[PDB]
Automatic annotation (TrEMBL), chain A:
Keywords: Ribonucleoprotein, Ribosomal protein. Belongs to the bacterial ribosomal protein bL28 family. GO terms for biological process: translation. Residues 1-19 are annotated as: Disordered. The keyword NADP does not apply. One of its GO terms (cellular component) is cytosolic large ribosomal subunit. GO terms for molecular function: structural constituent of ribosome. It comes from Vibrio natriegens NBRC 15636 = ATCC 14048 = DSM 759. It holds the Pfam family Ribosomal_L28. The keyword Ribosomal protein applies. This is Large ribosomal subunit protein bL28.
From TrEMBL, chain B:
Keywords: Ribonucleoprotein, Ribosomal protein. One of its GO terms (biological process) is translation. The gene is rpmH. It comes from the Bacteria. Belongs to the bacterial ribosomal protein bL34 family. PROSITE patterns: RIBOSOMAL_L34. This is Large ribosomal subunit protein bL34. InterPro entries: Ribosomal_bL34, Ribosomal_bL34_CS. One of its GO terms (molecular function) is structural constituent of ribosome. Gene3D superfamilies: 1.10.287.3980.
Automatic annotation (TrEMBL), chain C:
This is Large ribosomal subunit protein bL9. It comes from Vibrio natriegens NBRC 15636 = ATCC 14048 = DSM 759. Binds to the 23S rRNA. The chain holds residues 1 to 40 of 150 of the full protein. Belongs to the bacterial ribosomal protein bL9 family. Residues 13-40 form the Ribosomal protein L9 domain.
Length: 77, 44, 40
RNA sequence: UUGACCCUGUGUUGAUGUUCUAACGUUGACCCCUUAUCGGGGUUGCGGACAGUGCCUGGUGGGUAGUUUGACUGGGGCGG
RNA sequence: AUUAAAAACACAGCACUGUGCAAAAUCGUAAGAUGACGUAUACGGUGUGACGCCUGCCCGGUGCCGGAAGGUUAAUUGAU
RNA sequence: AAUGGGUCAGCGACUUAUAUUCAGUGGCAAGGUUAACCAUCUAGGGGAGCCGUAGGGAAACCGAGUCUUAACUGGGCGUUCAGUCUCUGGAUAUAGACCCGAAACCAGGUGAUCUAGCCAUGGGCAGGUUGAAGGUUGAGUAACAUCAACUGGAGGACCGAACCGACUAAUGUUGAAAAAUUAGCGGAUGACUUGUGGCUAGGGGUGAAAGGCCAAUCAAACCUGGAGAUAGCUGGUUCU
RNA sequence: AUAGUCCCGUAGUUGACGAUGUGUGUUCAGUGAAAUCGAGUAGGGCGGGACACGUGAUAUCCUGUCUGAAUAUGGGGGGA
RNA sequence: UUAGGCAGUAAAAGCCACUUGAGUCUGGGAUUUCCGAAUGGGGAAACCCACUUACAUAAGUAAGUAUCCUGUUGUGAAUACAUAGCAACAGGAGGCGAACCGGGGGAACUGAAACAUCUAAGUACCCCGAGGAAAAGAAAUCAACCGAGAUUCCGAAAGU
């Protein structure tokens, strides 16, 4: 699914709102991207489907902490 | 004149049979519904 | 992204020099190849 | 290459073009999982910061949808 | 289907047009499909409708295609 | 000679809850009354609150006054009259709100055993005609080309059964039949027809295109739910 | 046929081997558990949504997108 | 527990029992075909066909054999290591159920005497996940310079 593996950001629902204030349902999708992260400890690339925010989090926390978090959540990484 | 009911057993089973109902979520919903209603016959 | 150069880079700077780089440069080149590290 | 700004030519940013590879693409090739025209991983080639996607944004948009389209009236419409 | 069998539809033939292949187009949120295990002598759309003789004038409108100079113009930016 | 009623029996239409207001009745009275809750539970506790007891002004605020205005000779409203809580009733509000009735809209399901198209695998097509290309042997040409005879067996070819269809008429129309029968009629080796099994599903499919067909239903299937939609309309509305 | 006194019951009084449930201790083995006082966080920009509150002068909350502190000398709120 | 009992329709029949093995009642054991989550594979539910291992000698019998998740053991690619993969084992799960609960999605009719903001309504419905309840909960809360002290539910304030 369109779900960030790092953050959990999934598609949320909201309204489109015209000038006439007509509300149509819409979705707000996460800016999901796929990126291969080299993980030193495991001497491998790990391809993650993550939001661009997720990448920023991996830049702050490093891949090793994030991989740990994910594996705990039962992400298959 | 050819009327609408042109039975074959196989087509009856493959469409309305138990294993057909049980295969899908919405089919199981039907079986459960009929079982709740008290229907002697759950499937055709 | 602030990074510590673990070697001399053409323009960035010398070994042990702290420099802001674009996060792509760090993420995709400098850090993967050991030319720098995150300036935590 | 060039614009702004910065000081005293200099940096700091912005375009623009070329080149590059390292993100990313690959519905090229080969290897393995593997008895597999799926998929994944590996290798390599070709591309390459383009494409593509998310958020925002202008346009277009009967493709689709919800609706509106007055009253009087010597029927009603037309006219008034 | 059950008041219309026809001059209506189709048709071979014709023409315009899209489409360079991860084709266009269509189904689908997507993956994936059809197109096609095809590749411009192909595929899709549109009209015309065997065959013969032919198919005039108008590009103002509205499409579509092309052109970009200038004018107008969104998010954005944030000078005063 | 407008509607409805064949008849009888049975059933079938102004309700209920909550709040506002008016009236009657009762209690208490410048007071009246408690709510949840507690409770040895229709008692009794419980004063939170509500109404009344003051009005004027947009308001601050003032207050038997106040507001207006710079100020009223003024002027507006008020002053000077019993309320309150039960019970019963009349209205009203919110709820299906007197009962019955749409065409429709939406959501989730069920249907391609009919029919449309397609897919795969099987089958069917009496009998009779016509005589394409091609070939052969004679000609014939420089060689072609060309000619005759024979052969050959083409075709959304011809006639015509099965089969598929449905042009006309009559019957039938409370049918033998919710589309037929009888006499004729078209196609009948094909864009044919048929069996079995697959696939496509409702703003969806499928359509040699008729808005045709998608189970005797289709300008948006059927079922269930929202749902007692809504109905400024029609009907009906029961003793003296 | 219409029952205090016919019957079954009722009031009252008794009954559980075993099996269950409950509540207490007294134990065990876990769990709570995220470790270590909270940063991609608070706040911000854009788009939405929730708060009685329809973007209004609109505080507060949530966040799809883009950003991004301070860190008790600090920070949040008290409806612009 | 005690004079009758062998279910009913439902009579017959053959029987049993009579102070306690007649029977009945309660509890707990045993047995418990096939189908069904259905789980060895398949399947037109109540059927068909297996493998493994034991046994049998004949052509049978019994047991075992799902998937996933989690963990642990082994093995174990492409490249060394390794990882993926593969296997074994253990422990879970799956289905059903009227409502209540939390969450993910989410109408329209209708009302507005038309209608689009708005309403209906975060309702109906679909989905996921519980539990005997759930959820919430121990102030980065209110208040107002006085103070209060988590959450939930009920009465008022107030149709303000």
């Amino acid at each position: 699914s369109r779900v960030c593996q790092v953050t959990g950001k999934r598609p949320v629902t909201g309204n489109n709102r015209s000038h006439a204030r007509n509300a149509t349902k819409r979705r707000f999708l996460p800016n999901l991207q796929t990126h291969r992260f080299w993980v030193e400890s495991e001497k491998r690339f790990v391809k993650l489907r993550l939001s661009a925010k997720g990448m920023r989090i991996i830049d702050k926390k490093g891949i090793d902490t994030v991989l740990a978090d994910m594996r705990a959540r039962g992400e298959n990484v | 004149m050819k009327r609408t009911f042109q039975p074959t057993v196989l087509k009856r089973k493959r469409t309305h049979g138990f294993r057909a109902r049980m295969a899908t979520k919405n089919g199981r919903k039907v079986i459960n519904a009929r079982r709740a209603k008290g229907r002697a016959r759950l499937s055709k | 992204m602030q990074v510590i150069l673990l070697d001399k880079i053409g323009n960035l700077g010398g070994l042990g020099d702290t420099v802001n780089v674009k996060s792509g440069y760090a993420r995709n080149f400098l850090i993967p190849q050991g030319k720098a590290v995150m300036a935590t």
